[PDB]
């Protein structure tokens, strides 16, 4: 993990995320959407659990992206919760929650749920 | 449970659901939306687990409602997963998933997640 997590990750749609996993459990980086234009880039911050077990378990982690940058304000945020699996074909499998700010009458439609798998390729 | 589940349940918004929990784990009934007009009523079908434990555990259950009736076709379905707790103040606590049929490009926004608590009052 840590060293293994640092790098570029891609999901089944093309989104790319670049992270630096620091010594003490911090995750910092950027997420970029499809197209890959200068700034479809947003800041991501998360944490990972830095002393994972030794039975081949995955490394639990999660991160958040607020969909606001200098070109777009989507008034929403996504959190990804999952684990990193290293090896020949390392991957991070996640489940995510995307919440949009709504009025109290529309709060029922405020959170979408999905899953993403990221690979180094 | 079973006898305890059968009856009318209301959630924090006013929705009402009426179920009959049958001897062999079946749940059948109707769900009605706010307003409570003749047919804001949809059919619900589910299952509950009929021989629950004796340490005060809740009774696991779930049901589905397809949002189509003779007045409306919302092209969606909701599933509620949770447990029934009996007693002075019995309640069913659930987490739900509402999926809308989308095209493959919009599948990412197809499922909303939320929670509901139902009481007899």
């Amino acid at each position: 993990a840590e060293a293994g997590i640092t790098g570029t990750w891609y999901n089944q749609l093309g989104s790319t995320f670049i992270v630096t996993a620091g010594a003490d459990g911090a995750l910092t980086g950027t997420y970029e959407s499809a197209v890959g234009n200068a700034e479809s880039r947003y800041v991501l911050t998360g944490r990972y659990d830095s002393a994972p077990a030794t039975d081949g378990s995955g490394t639990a982690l999660g991160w958040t992206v607020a969909w606001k940058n200098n070109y777009r304000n989507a008034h929403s945020a996504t959190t990804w919760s999952g684990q990193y699996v290293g090896g020949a074909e390392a991957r991070i499998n996640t489940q995510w929650l995307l919440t949009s700010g709504t009025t109290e009458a529309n709060a029922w439609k405020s959170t979408l749920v999905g899953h993403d798998t990221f690979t180094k390729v | 449970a079973e006898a305890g589940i059968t009856g009318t349940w209301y959630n924090q918004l006013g929705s009402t659901f009426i179920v009959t929990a049958g001897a062999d784990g079946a749940l059948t009934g109707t769900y009605e939306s706010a307003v409570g007009n003749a047919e804001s009523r949809y059919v619900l079908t589910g299952r509950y687990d009929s021989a629950p434990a004796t340490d005060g555990s809740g009774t696991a259950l779930g049901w589905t409602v397809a949002w189509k009736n003779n007045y409306r076709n919302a092209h969606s379905a909701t599933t509620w997963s949770g447990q029934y707790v009996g007693g002075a103040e019995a309640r069913i606590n659930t987490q739900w998933l509402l999926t809308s049929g989308t095209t493959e490009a919009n599948a990412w926004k197809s499922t909303l997640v939320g929670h509901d608590t139902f009481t007899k009052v």
Partner: peptide
């Protein structure tokens, strides 16, 4: 479409 995607 949403930035998470496009």
């Amino acid at each position: 479409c949403h930035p998470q995607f496009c």
